[PDB]
Amino acid sequence: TNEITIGITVTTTGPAAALGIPERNALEFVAKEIGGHPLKVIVLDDGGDPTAATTNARRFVTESKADVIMGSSVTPPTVAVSNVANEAQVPHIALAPLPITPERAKWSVAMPQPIPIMGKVLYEHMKKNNIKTVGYIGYSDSYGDLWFNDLKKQGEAMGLKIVAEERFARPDTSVAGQVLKLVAANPDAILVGASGTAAALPQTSLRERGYKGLIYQTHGAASMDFIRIAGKSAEGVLMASGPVMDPEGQDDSALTKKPGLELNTAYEAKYGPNSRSQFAAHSFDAFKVLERVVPVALKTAKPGTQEFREAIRKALVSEKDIAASQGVYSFTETDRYGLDDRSRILLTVKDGKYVMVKAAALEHHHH
Ligand SMILES: COc1cc(/C=C/C(=O)O)ccc1O
């Protein structure tokens, strides 16, 4: 019963607050002790800023002597947190997608779906609905590149033609010049590689300028905020999402159904109708991971030692089929996401509501 120390850096101020506030809110609904030991959870805002997240992670690993760290809410500070964790040798659970490199693989795993699983479900839909040419607009940063690179690699391997690439910066409040080019090229479909508030900006700008192709969005867009902001321009979007957005529609055999119901009932009872989100689920699921790996680490090591950090690291890879709201996690030395087809669905928006268009893979089918 000495504590297990968890440092979390998430984005609860600035425009990425749309992603970090739900992550931080969902901590009300996670375990407060594991295996006899209380969880000391220290939460700090980073504003989405890579330097502030580096500062928080640094102080967690050296001053707080954290056993685990988590964060951040968007890809650039998440990269920064991974770099701290892999230097300091501390288990890191990422709460936003990030490029895994050998520099980051040893000490980091990631809760959000990896870009290629999400891209696959979008591009298969494009192929099935008569799309040949695709344009892109996304952030001029590492998340923007993940998505563009996946669109080029997977999409071209499926016979899609990528006819236009545009970028914008996160704080931009206008994409007039990029929308101008995209409308000119008039692709059959446009993939928007963005998140939260910023994801609704190319959505509205494109419709206001009379684009009439299909618009596709990533799982960075999967909260009610996108509908609140995009209004009617949201209609008929196609959006990749984790299954936590619709546990009701899952088969009772889905290992993700129960925990998704658990999170959403609590979250929405507090925060209101349709307040569920892709993002709240990541911190909830991170604590489901901890519930599996910590009792295993506790057999051979005490909280607050390097040996405990090492034991968690190993357990992340020895413990298979970890059921959570967003998927069933089996991490490996080389797969730091640990996810398969059970971790994604496709949503549309119809009359201001998300509707599931394509279900996650069934438990008793191939993955
Ligand atoms: C918080 O959860 C998520 C965040 C993002 C945001 C990416 C970015 O803007 O860098 C994408 C997918 C997620 O599941």
Numbering used by the authors: 28 to 394
Sentences from the study reporting this entry:
Data from a combination of fluorescence spectroscopy and ITC clearly show that both proteins have binding affinities in the nanomolar range for coumarate, caffeate and ferulate, with weaker (but still high affinity) binding of cinnamate. The structure displays all the features expected of an ABC-bacterial periplasmic binding protein; namely a two-domain structure in which an intrinsic cleft positioned between the two domains forms the ligand-binding pocket.
Thus, we will not discuss its structure further here, other than to note that the mode of ligand binding is identical to that for ferulate. A summary of the relevant data processing and refinement statistics for the ferulate complex and the ligand free form are presented in Table 3, and the 1.9 Å structure of CouP with ferulate bound is shown in Figure 5. Analysis of the interactions in the binding cleft show that the aromatic ring of the ligand is bound most deeply. H-bond interactions are also made between the carboxyl group on the ferulate side chain and Arg197, Ser222 and Thr102. These latter interactions explain why compounds such as 4-hydroxybenzoate showed no evidence of binding; they lack the 3-carbon chain that ensures optimal bond distances on each side of the binding cleft are formed. The methoxy-group possessed by ferulate sits in a pocket bounded by the side chains of Leu46, Phe306 and His309 and the main chain carbonyl oxygen atoms of Ser100 and Leu122. There are also close ligand contacts with Glu50, Phe306 and His309. The data also explain how structurally similar ligand contaminants like 4-HPP can be incorporated into the binding pocket.
